[PDB]
Coordinates of C-alpha atoms in Angstrom, one line a residue:
Chain E
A1 CA 23.8 17.0 43.2
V2 CA 27.7 18.0 44.0
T3 CA 28.1 14.5 44.6
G4 CA 30.0 15.3 48.8
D5 CA 27.2 17.7 49.7
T6 CA 25.5 15.3 52.2
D7 CA 29.0 14.4 54.1
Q8 CA 28.6 18.4 54.7
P9 CA 27.9 19.7 57.9
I10 CA 24.0 21.4 58.0
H11 CA 24.2 25.1 58.7
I12 CA 20.9 26.5 60.0
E13 CA 20.8 30.1 60.7
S14 CA 17.1 32.1 61.9
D15 CA 16.0 34.6 64.0
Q16 CA 14.8 32.2 66.8
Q17 CA 15.4 29.0 67.6
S18 CA 13.3 26.7 69.8
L19 CA 15.0 23.4 71.1
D20 CA 12.5 21.0 72.6
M21 CA 14.2 18.3 74.9
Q22 CA 11.4 16.0 75.2
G23 CA 10.5 14.7 72.1
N24 CA 13.8 16.1 70.3
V25 CA 12.8 18.2 67.9
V26 CA 14.3 21.7 67.1
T27 CA 12.4 24.6 65.2
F28 CA 14.0 28.0 63.7
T29 CA 11.7 30.5 62.7
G30 CA 12.6 33.9 60.9
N31 CA 14.9 34.2 57.4
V32 CA 15.8 30.9 58.1
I33 CA 18.4 29.7 55.7
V34 CA 19.8 26.1 55.7
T35 CA 23.0 24.7 54.3
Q36 CA 24.8 22.1 53.1
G37 CA 27.8 22.1 50.6
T38 CA 26.2 23.3 47.5
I39 CA 22.5 22.8 48.7
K40 CA 20.5 26.0 50.5
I41 CA 17.0 25.7 51.6
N42 CA 14.9 28.8 52.6
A43 CA 11.7 28.9 54.7
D44 CA 10.2 30.8 57.0
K45 CA 10.1 27.4 59.3
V46 CA 12.2 24.9 60.0
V47 CA 11.6 22.1 61.9
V48 CA 14.2 19.5 62.1
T49 CA 13.4 16.2 63.4
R50 CA 15.9 12.6 63.8
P51 CA 12.8 9.8 63.9
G52 CA 14.3 6.7 65.7
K57 CA 18.7 9.8 59.7
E58 CA 17.5 13.6 60.2
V59 CA 14.7 15.0 58.6
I60 CA 14.5 18.5 57.4
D61 CA 11.1 20.2 56.8
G62 CA 11.1 23.6 55.2
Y63 CA 7.7 26.1 54.9
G64 CA 7.3 29.3 52.8
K65 CA 5.4 30.7 50.8
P66 CA 6.9 29.1 49.0
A67 CA 10.2 27.6 50.5
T68 CA 13.0 27.8 48.1
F69 CA 15.6 24.6 46.9
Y70 CA 19.0 24.9 45.5
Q71 CA 22.2 22.9 44.4
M72 CA 24.9 22.8 41.8
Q73 CA 25.2 19.6 40.3
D74 CA 28.5 18.1 39.1
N75 CA 28.3 19.8 35.6
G76 CA 28.3 23.0 37.5
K77 CA 25.2 24.0 36.5
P78 CA 22.2 24.5 39.2
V79 CA 19.0 22.7 40.4
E80 CA 16.5 24.9 41.9
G81 CA 12.8 24.9 42.7
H82 CA 10.2 25.8 45.5
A83 CA 6.7 24.9 47.0
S84 CA 4.8 25.3 49.8
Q85 CA 6.6 22.5 51.8
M86 CA 10.8 21.2 51.3
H87 CA 10.7 17.9 52.8
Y88 CA 14.3 16.7 53.0
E89 CA 15.2 13.0 54.4
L90 CA 19.1 13.4 54.9
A91 CA 19.5 9.4 55.3
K92 CA 18.1 8.9 51.5
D93 CA 19.3 11.9 50.3
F94 CA 15.5 12.7 49.1
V95 CA 13.5 15.9 48.7
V96 CA 10.2 16.1 48.6
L97 CA 8.5 19.5 47.4
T98 CA 4.3 20.1 48.3
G99 CA 2.1 22.3 47.6
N100 CA 2.3 24.2 44.1
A101 CA 5.7 22.5 43.8
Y102 CA 8.0 23.6 41.0
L103 CA 11.4 21.8 40.1
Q104 CA 13.9 22.7 37.3
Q105 CA 17.0 21.6 35.7
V106 CA 19.1 23.1 32.7
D107 CA 17.4 21.1 30.0
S108 CA 13.8 20.5 32.0
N109 CA 11.2 21.3 34.4
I110 CA 8.0 20.0 36.0
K111 CA 5.1 21.7 38.0
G112 CA 3.0 19.8 40.3
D113 CA 1.5 19.3 43.7
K114 CA 4.1 16.7 44.8
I115 CA 7.5 16.4 43.2
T116 CA 9.7 14.4 44.8
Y117 CA 13.5 14.2 44.0
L118 CA 15.9 11.2 44.6
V119 CA 19.2 13.4 44.5
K120 CA 21.7 10.2 44.3
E121 CA 19.5 8.9 41.8
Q122 CA 19.4 11.5 39.3
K123 CA 15.3 10.7 39.3
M124 CA 12.5 13.2 39.9
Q125 CA 8.8 12.2 39.7
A126 CA 5.5 14.5 40.0
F127 CA 2.3 13.8 41.2
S128 CA -0.8 15.8 40.7
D129 CA -4.1 16.1 42.7
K130 CA -7.6 14.8 42.2
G131 CA -9.0 17.5 39.1
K132 CA -5.0 18.7 38.4
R133 CA -2.2 17.8 36.2
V134 CA 1.4 17.9 36.5
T135 CA 3.2 20.2 33.4
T136 CA 6.7 18.9 32.1
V137 CA 8.1 20.9 29.9
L138 CA 11.9 19.7 27.7
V139 CA 14.2 22.4 27.1
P140 CA 15.8 22.1 23.7
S141 CA 19.4 22.1 23.7
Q142 CA 20.0 25.7 22.5
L143 CA 17.9 27.3 24.8
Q144 CA 19.4 25.9 27.6
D145 CA 21.4 28.5 30.2
Chain R
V2 CA 6.7 20.8 10.1
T3 CA 10.5 20.2 9.8
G4 CA 11.6 22.6 12.5
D5 CA 9.2 20.3 15.1
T6 CA 12.5 19.1 16.6
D7 CA 13.8 22.0 18.0
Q8 CA 11.2 23.5 19.9
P9 CA 10.3 22.7 23.2
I10 CA 8.2 19.4 24.7
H11 CA 5.4 20.3 26.5
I12 CA 3.8 17.5 28.3
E13 CA 0.5 17.4 30.9
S14 CA 0.0 14.0 33.2
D15 CA -1.7 12.6 36.0
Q16 CA 2.0 11.4 37.1
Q17 CA 5.7 12.0 35.6
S18 CA 8.7 9.8 36.3
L19 CA 12.1 11.5 35.1
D20 CA 15.2 9.3 34.8
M21 CA 18.2 12.4 33.9
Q22 CA 21.1 10.1 33.8
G23 CA 19.6 8.1 31.1
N24 CA 17.7 10.3 29.9
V25 CA 14.0 9.0 29.9
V26 CA 10.6 10.9 31.0
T27 CA 7.7 8.3 31.8
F28 CA 4.2 10.1 31.7
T29 CA 0.7 8.3 32.8
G30 CA -2.7 9.5 33.1
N31 CA -4.5 11.0 30.2
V32 CA -1.1 12.3 28.8
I33 CA -0.8 15.3 26.4
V34 CA 2.2 15.7 24.6
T35 CA 2.7 18.9 22.4
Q36 CA 6.1 19.7 20.5
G37 CA 5.6 23.0 18.0
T38 CA 3.2 21.0 15.3
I39 CA 3.1 17.9 17.1
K40 CA 0.0 16.5 19.1
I41 CA 0.1 13.2 20.9
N42 CA -2.5 11.5 22.8
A43 CA -2.3 8.7 25.0
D44 CA -2.3 6.9 28.6
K45 CA 1.1 6.0 28.6
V46 CA 4.1 8.0 27.1
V47 CA 7.6 7.7 27.3
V48 CA 10.2 9.9 25.5
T49 CA 13.8 9.5 25.4
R50 CA 16.7 12.3 24.3
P51 CA 19.8 10.3 23.8
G52 CA 22.6 12.8 25.1
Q55 CA 17.0 16.0 21.6
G56 CA 17.7 15.5 17.5
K57 CA 18.0 11.5 18.3
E58 CA 14.7 11.6 20.1
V59 CA 12.1 9.4 20.4
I60 CA 8.3 9.4 21.8
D61 CA 6.3 6.0 22.4
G62 CA 2.4 6.2 23.4
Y63 CA 0.3 3.6 24.8
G64 CA -3.8 4.4 23.7
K65 CA -7.2 2.3 23.4
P66 CA -7.0 5.0 20.7
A67 CA -3.9 6.5 21.0
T68 CA -3.5 9.4 18.7
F69 CA -0.9 11.2 16.5
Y70 CA -1.2 14.6 14.8
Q71 CA 1.5 16.8 13.1
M72 CA 1.6 19.4 10.5
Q73 CA 3.7 18.7 7.4
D74 CA 5.3 21.4 5.5
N75 CA 3.1 21.4 2.3
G76 CA 0.7 22.5 5.1
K77 CA -1.7 19.5 5.0
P78 CA -2.1 17.6 8.5
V79 CA -1.1 13.9 9.2
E80 CA -3.4 12.2 12.0
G81 CA -3.7 8.8 12.9
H82 CA -4.5 6.6 15.7
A83 CA -3.1 2.8 17.1
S84 CA -2.8 1.3 20.4
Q85 CA 0.8 1.9 20.1
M86 CA 3.0 4.8 18.8
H87 CA 6.3 4.8 17.9
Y88 CA 8.2 8.4 16.4
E89 CA 11.6 8.5 16.0
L90 CA 12.1 12.4 15.1
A91 CA 15.8 11.4 14.1
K92 CA 14.9 9.3 11.1
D93 CA 11.2 11.5 10.4
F94 CA 9.8 8.0 11.1
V95 CA 6.3 6.9 12.8
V96 CA 5.0 3.6 13.4
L97 CA 1.5 3.0 14.6
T98 CA 0.7 -0.5 15.7
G99 CA -2.6 -2.4 16.5
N100 CA -5.5 -0.9 14.6
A101 CA -3.5 1.4 12.8
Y102 CA -5.2 4.2 10.9
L103 CA -3.3 7.1 9.2
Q104 CA -4.6 10.0 7.0
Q105 CA -3.4 13.2 5.7
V106 CA -6.4 14.9 4.0
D107 CA -7.5 13.2 1.1
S108 CA -4.8 10.1 1.7
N109 CA -5.7 7.3 4.0
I110 CA -4.1 3.9 5.0
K111 CA -5.8 1.3 7.7
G112 CA -3.8 -1.9 8.8
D113 CA -2.1 -3.8 11.8
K114 CA 0.6 -1.8 11.5
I115 CA 1.5 1.2 10.0
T116 CA 4.9 2.8 9.0
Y117 CA 5.2 6.8 7.7
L118 CA 8.0 8.1 6.5
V119 CA 7.5 12.0 7.3
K120 CA 10.2 13.2 4.8
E121 CA 9.7 10.7 1.8
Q122 CA 6.3 11.4 1.7
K123 CA 5.4 7.5 1.8
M124 CA 3.1 5.1 4.3
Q125 CA 3.0 1.5 4.6
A126 CA 0.5 -0.7 5.6
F127 CA 1.0 -4.4 7.2
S128 CA -1.4 -7.4 8.6
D129 CA -1.0 -10.2 11.0
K130 CA -2.6 -13.5 10.2
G131 CA -5.0 -10.9 8.4
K132 CA -4.8 -9.0 5.5
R133 CA -5.1 -5.3 4.3
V134 CA -7.8 -4.0 2.4
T135 CA -8.9 -0.7 0.7
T136 CA -11.8 0.5 -1.6
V137 CA -11.1 3.3 -4.4
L138 CA -13.9 4.1 -6.8
Chain I
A1 CA -18.8 -7.7 -19.9
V2 CA -21.4 -7.3 -17.5
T3 CA -22.7 -4.1 -18.0
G4 CA -22.2 -2.2 -15.3
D5 CA -19.4 -3.4 -13.3
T6 CA -17.4 -0.1 -14.8
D7 CA -19.7 1.7 -12.7
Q8 CA -19.3 -0.3 -9.4
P9 CA -16.5 0.6 -7.1
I10 CA -13.2 -1.0 -7.3
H11 CA -12.5 -3.2 -3.9
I12 CA -8.6 -4.5 -3.5
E13 CA -7.0 -7.0 -1.0
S14 CA -3.5 -7.5 -0.1
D15 CA -1.1 -8.8 2.3
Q16 CA 1.0 -4.9 2.5
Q17 CA -0.2 -1.7 0.6
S18 CA 2.2 0.9 0.3
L19 CA 1.1 4.4 -0.6
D20 CA 3.5 7.2 -2.2
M21 CA 1.7 10.6 -1.7
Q22 CA 4.4 12.6 -3.8
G23 CA 3.8 10.9 -7.4
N24 CA 0.6 9.5 -6.2
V25 CA 0.9 5.4 -6.7
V26 CA -0.5 3.1 -4.6
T27 CA 0.8 -0.7 -4.6
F28 CA -0.5 -3.6 -3.2
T29 CA 1.7 -7.2 -2.6
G30 CA 0.3 -9.8 -1.1
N31 CA -2.4 -12.3 -2.5
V32 CA -3.9 -9.5 -4.2
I33 CA -7.4 -10.0 -4.8
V34 CA -8.8 -7.0 -7.1
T35 CA -12.3 -6.9 -7.6
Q36 CA -15.1 -4.5 -9.4
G37 CA -18.4 -6.4 -10.0
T38 CA -17.8 -9.2 -11.6
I39 CA -14.4 -8.7 -12.7
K40 CA -11.8 -10.0 -10.8
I41 CA -7.6 -10.1 -10.7
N42 CA -5.7 -11.8 -8.9
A43 CA -1.7 -10.8 -8.9
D44 CA 1.7 -10.8 -6.7
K45 CA 2.3 -6.9 -6.8
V46 CA -0.9 -4.6 -8.0
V47 CA 0.1 -0.9 -8.9
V48 CA -2.5 1.7 -9.1
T49 CA -1.6 5.0 -11.0
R50 CA -4.0 8.0 -12.0
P51 CA -2.0 9.6 -14.7
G52 CA -3.2 13.6 -15.1
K57 CA -9.0 7.7 -15.2
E58 CA -7.7 5.2 -12.9
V59 CA -4.2 2.5 -14.5
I60 CA -4.2 -0.5 -12.3
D61 CA -1.2 -3.1 -13.4
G62 CA -1.0 -6.8 -12.0
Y63 CA 2.0 -8.7 -12.1
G64 CA 2.0 -12.8 -11.4
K65 CA 3.0 -16.0 -12.1
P66 CA 1.1 -15.3 -13.9
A67 CA -1.7 -13.0 -12.9
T68 CA -5.3 -13.6 -13.7
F69 CA -8.2 -12.1 -14.7
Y70 CA -11.8 -12.7 -14.6
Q71 CA -15.5 -11.7 -16.1
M72 CA -19.2 -13.1 -16.2
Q73 CA -20.7 -11.6 -19.8
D74 CA -24.0 -10.3 -19.6
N75 CA -25.2 -14.1 -21.1
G76 CA -24.1 -15.6 -17.8
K77 CA -20.8 -16.9 -19.3
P78 CA -17.3 -16.0 -18.3
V79 CA -14.2 -14.8 -19.6
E80 CA -11.0 -15.9 -18.3
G81 CA -7.5 -15.4 -19.2
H82 CA -3.7 -15.0 -17.3
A83 CA -0.7 -13.1 -18.1
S84 CA 2.3 -12.0 -16.3
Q85 CA 1.0 -9.0 -16.9
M86 CA -2.7 -7.7 -16.6
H87 CA -3.1 -3.5 -17.5
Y88 CA -6.4 -2.4 -17.0
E89 CA -7.2 1.0 -18.2
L90 CA -10.6 2.0 -15.9
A91 CA -11.4 4.8 -18.0
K92 CA -11.4 3.2 -21.6
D93 CA -12.5 0.0 -20.2
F94 CA -9.0 -2.1 -21.9
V95 CA -7.5 -5.1 -20.2
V96 CA -4.0 -5.7 -22.1
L97 CA -2.7 -8.9 -21.4
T98 CA 1.4 -9.4 -22.0
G99 CA 3.8 -12.4 -21.4
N100 CA 2.6 -15.9 -22.2
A101 CA -0.9 -14.5 -22.4
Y102 CA -4.2 -16.0 -23.1
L103 CA -7.6 -14.9 -23.1
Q104 CA -10.9 -17.7 -23.0
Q105 CA -14.2 -17.0 -24.0
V106 CA -17.4 -19.4 -24.2
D107 CA -16.5 -19.8 -27.9
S108 CA -12.8 -19.1 -28.7
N109 CA -9.9 -18.7 -27.1
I110 CA -6.1 -16.8 -28.0
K111 CA -2.8 -17.1 -26.8
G112 CA 0.1 -14.8 -27.6
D113 CA 2.5 -12.3 -26.5
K114 CA 0.3 -9.4 -26.1
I115 CA -3.7 -9.6 -25.9
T116 CA -5.7 -6.5 -25.7
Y117 CA -9.5 -6.5 -24.7
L118 CA -12.1 -3.8 -25.2
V119 CA -14.7 -5.1 -23.0
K120 CA -17.4 -2.0 -24.0
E121 CA -16.9 -3.1 -27.7
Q122 CA -16.2 -6.8 -27.4
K123 CA -13.3 -6.8 -29.6
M124 CA -10.0 -8.6 -28.7
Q125 CA -6.8 -8.6 -30.6
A126 CA -3.5 -10.5 -30.4
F127 CA -0.2 -10.4 -31.0
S128 CA 3.1 -12.3 -31.0
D129 CA 6.7 -11.0 -31.1
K130 CA 9.2 -11.5 -33.8
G131 CA 9.9 -15.2 -33.7
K132 CA 6.7 -16.5 -32.2
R133 CA 3.1 -16.7 -32.9
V134 CA -0.4 -16.1 -31.7
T135 CA -3.1 -19.6 -31.8
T136 CA -6.8 -18.9 -31.7
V137 CA -9.7 -21.2 -31.7
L138 CA -13.1 -21.2 -32.9
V139 CA -15.1 -23.3 -30.1
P140 CA -17.4 -25.7 -32.5
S141 CA -20.9 -24.8 -31.4
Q142 CA -21.5 -28.1 -29.3
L143 CA -18.0 -28.3 -27.8
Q144 CA -18.9 -25.4 -25.6
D145 CA -19.4 -25.1 -21.8
Chain G
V2 CA -14.9 -34.7 -45.2
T3 CA -18.4 -34.1 -44.6
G4 CA -17.8 -33.7 -41.0
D5 CA -15.1 -31.0 -40.6
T6 CA -17.6 -28.3 -40.3
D7 CA -18.3 -29.5 -36.7
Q8 CA -14.5 -29.5 -36.3
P9 CA -12.8 -26.8 -34.1
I10 CA -10.8 -24.0 -36.0
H11 CA -7.0 -23.4 -35.1
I12 CA -5.3 -20.8 -36.5
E13 CA -1.9 -19.2 -36.5
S14 CA -1.2 -16.1 -37.2
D15 CA 1.6 -13.1 -36.2
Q16 CA -1.8 -11.0 -35.5
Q17 CA -5.2 -11.4 -34.9
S18 CA -8.5 -9.1 -34.3
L19 CA -11.8 -10.7 -33.3
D20 CA -15.2 -8.9 -33.0
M21 CA -17.3 -11.1 -30.9
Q22 CA -20.3 -8.9 -31.7
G23 CA -20.4 -9.1 -35.3
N24 CA -19.0 -12.5 -35.2
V25 CA -15.7 -12.1 -37.4
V26 CA -12.1 -13.0 -36.9
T27 CA -9.1 -11.3 -39.3
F28 CA -5.7 -12.7 -39.3
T29 CA -2.4 -11.3 -40.7
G30 CA 0.8 -12.7 -41.3
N31 CA 1.3 -16.1 -42.5
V32 CA -2.2 -17.3 -41.5
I33 CA -2.3 -20.9 -41.6
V34 CA -6.2 -22.4 -40.7
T35 CA -6.5 -25.8 -39.8
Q36 CA -10.2 -27.5 -39.6
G37 CA -10.5 -31.2 -39.5
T38 CA -8.8 -32.2 -43.2
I39 CA -9.3 -28.2 -44.2
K40 CA -5.8 -26.6 -44.2
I41 CA -5.2 -22.8 -45.5
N42 CA -2.3 -20.8 -46.1
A43 CA -2.7 -17.0 -46.9
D44 CA -1.5 -13.7 -45.7
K45 CA -4.7 -12.7 -44.8
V46 CA -7.3 -14.6 -43.7
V47 CA -11.3 -13.5 -42.6
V48 CA -13.7 -16.2 -40.8
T49 CA -17.4 -15.3 -40.4
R50 CA -19.7 -18.0 -37.8
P51 CA -22.8 -15.6 -38.0
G52 CA -24.5 -16.9 -35.0
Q55 CA -20.5 -22.3 -37.3
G56 CA -22.5 -24.5 -39.5
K57 CA -22.9 -21.0 -41.7
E58 CA -18.9 -20.6 -41.1
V59 CA -17.3 -18.7 -44.0
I60 CA -13.2 -18.4 -45.0
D61 CA -12.0 -16.0 -46.8
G62 CA -8.1 -16.1 -47.9
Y63 CA -5.8 -13.9 -49.7
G64 CA -2.3 -14.9 -50.5
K65 CA -0.3 -14.2 -53.7
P66 CA -0.4 -18.1 -54.2
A67 CA -2.9 -18.5 -51.4
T68 CA -3.6 -22.0 -50.9
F69 CA -6.4 -24.4 -50.1
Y70 CA -6.3 -28.2 -48.9
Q71 CA -9.3 -30.6 -48.0
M72 CA -10.0 -34.4 -47.9
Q73 CA -13.3 -35.4 -49.6
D74 CA -15.1 -38.2 -48.4
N75 CA -13.7 -40.9 -51.2
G76 CA -10.4 -40.4 -50.0
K77 CA -9.3 -38.2 -52.8
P78 CA -7.5 -34.8 -51.7
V79 CA -8.7 -31.5 -53.1
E80 CA -6.1 -28.9 -53.7
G81 CA -5.7 -25.5 -55.3
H82 CA -4.7 -21.6 -54.9
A83 CA -5.4 -18.5 -56.0
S84 CA -5.5 -15.0 -55.5
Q85 CA -8.3 -15.0 -53.4
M86 CA -9.8 -17.9 -51.6
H87 CA -13.6 -17.9 -50.7
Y88 CA -15.2 -21.1 -48.9
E89 CA -18.9 -21.1 -47.6
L90 CA -19.4 -24.2 -45.8
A91 CA -22.8 -23.9 -45.3
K92 CA -23.6 -24.3 -49.4
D93 CA -20.3 -26.6 -49.7
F94 CA -18.9 -24.2 -51.8
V95 CA -15.2 -22.8 -52.6
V96 CA -14.2 -20.1 -54.9
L97 CA -10.9 -19.3 -56.3
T98 CA -10.1 -15.9 -58.0
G99 CA -6.9 -14.8 -59.4
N100 CA -4.7 -17.2 -60.9
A101 CA -7.0 -20.1 -59.8
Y102 CA -5.5 -23.9 -59.6
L103 CA -7.6 -26.4 -58.5
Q104 CA -6.9 -30.3 -59.2
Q105 CA -8.2 -33.6 -57.3
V106 CA -5.6 -36.1 -57.7
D107 CA -5.6 -36.9 -61.5
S108 CA -8.4 -34.0 -62.4
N109 CA -7.6 -30.7 -62.7
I110 CA -8.5 -27.6 -63.9
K111 CA -7.4 -23.4 -64.2
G112 CA -8.7 -20.0 -64.6
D113 CA -9.1 -16.5 -63.5
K114 CA -11.8 -18.1 -61.2
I115 CA -12.6 -21.4 -60.4
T116 CA -15.8 -22.6 -58.4
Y117 CA -16.1 -25.3 -57.0
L118 CA -19.1 -27.4 -55.7
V119 CA -17.6 -30.3 -53.1
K120 CA -20.4 -32.1 -52.5
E121 CA -21.5 -32.1 -56.1
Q122 CA -18.1 -32.8 -57.0
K123 CA -18.3 -30.5 -59.8
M124 CA -15.9 -27.5 -61.1
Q125 CA -16.3 -24.6 -63.3
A126 CA -13.5 -22.3 -64.4
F127 CA -13.8 -19.0 -66.0
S128 CA -11.6 -16.2 -67.5
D129 CA -12.0 -12.2 -67.9
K130 CA -11.2 -10.5 -71.0
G131 CA -9.5 -13.9 -71.9
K132 CA -9.7 -17.5 -72.6
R133 CA -10.0 -21.2 -70.5
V134 CA -7.5 -23.8 -72.1
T135 CA -6.7 -27.5 -71.5
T136 CA -5.1 -30.0 -73.3
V137 CA -6.5 -33.7 -73.4
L138 CA -4.5 -36.7 -74.3

């Protein structure tokens, strides 16, 4: 992750916005674009919660994720849902999830991504499988 | 074949963890690794790309299997509890009930060492003994 | 030689085994025991070659040779090296060689033994000699 | 001595061939046969044990020598080009420049026959003649 993204303001943009004062849930619908530094999430619906520290959930067909790494190369991925826990800098993709790095990619039903640890995990549902491919250092863009 | 090292690694598993700092990938649950003409089956696989040419594959299975086509069109196949493949040094090590064959040739032992380019196999025994029958 | 030994599988046993696919040389090291019927060779190292029909070379301190004869009596001998050519059933002992039959023995630097001919020859190096003793038919075991 | 026939045969040679089917041994190169109190030197020796009591020793030498102790403590010694000893019939035959002596007694001829138990020697001549001098 471009180190320092986390310390940036979270800019959201959408058509509609709903704000629920009791409960404290903010919703955005439309061409929802959420940006934080180089981080970019696109979804149809984005709901941000502050349980108790912010959490951001994105829903799309699919919801996309982008972020530049310290080396100038991007990380990209999509899934039915992007769960981003701001505090842990932890991104979870579920539902036909896909995540891509310059030297490797992963396809699965759930992909977790600890950004400030540079560690990714992927999981499959009963009857299904994870696909990982390591890109040879010469087929990399 | 010699050009397998430059081929992409395709892995299927029930789950995986990828440490991209320390360039290590761990796969578990009916893992199938294929890289060029290399196929590996195991319960757990660990692949390490220090820096791909210095790549290392470790496989753990009840039989855990290894397969690779050779340049002279003869495939190498074998199985063991643990399987270790150093692609840098074209070197395979099979441990625990190891078996390895290349068509008409074969060997068995508690540990098999297999130099892929030198085309030379070696079998070793624990507290036991290696044993063959030639006609 | 117990007639029919030659038609038996050659069983080898050792600690390590090396197999050299280019060249076609199989090596065995350790408490190498090679058996074929009643034939038994013990060595530290055994290398089997198929020039072109198998050949088996045994090295020990010394490498030993045993085989029961059709009459129930054994032939035994030892030397630094046991060269056994399977095709000709021809055993050569070299290096402080010794060969023993129920009624006779031979000590020399090289002893050849055509098993399927029941003929033995022994040789000495310049400056050395062969010793043959014929055992009286009453001092025989 | 009479019990020599039951004694082991010790032979030294540069080389030997032993046919164990047809019970024949051939020795070449400075051969030394010793059996009890029997010593034989020759370039080539052939010993045959049909079945040892029917043993036969043939010796070939430039002098080729024979030696055997007798029961009465007097040794028999002689030499010839060819030497033939039938231990079954206590019989020695020396051919070609034969010489044989037993202490004070002796004989010379182209062929000497020597009955060991009868203590009786005989000398024969080719196209020539036997010859002695008595004082």
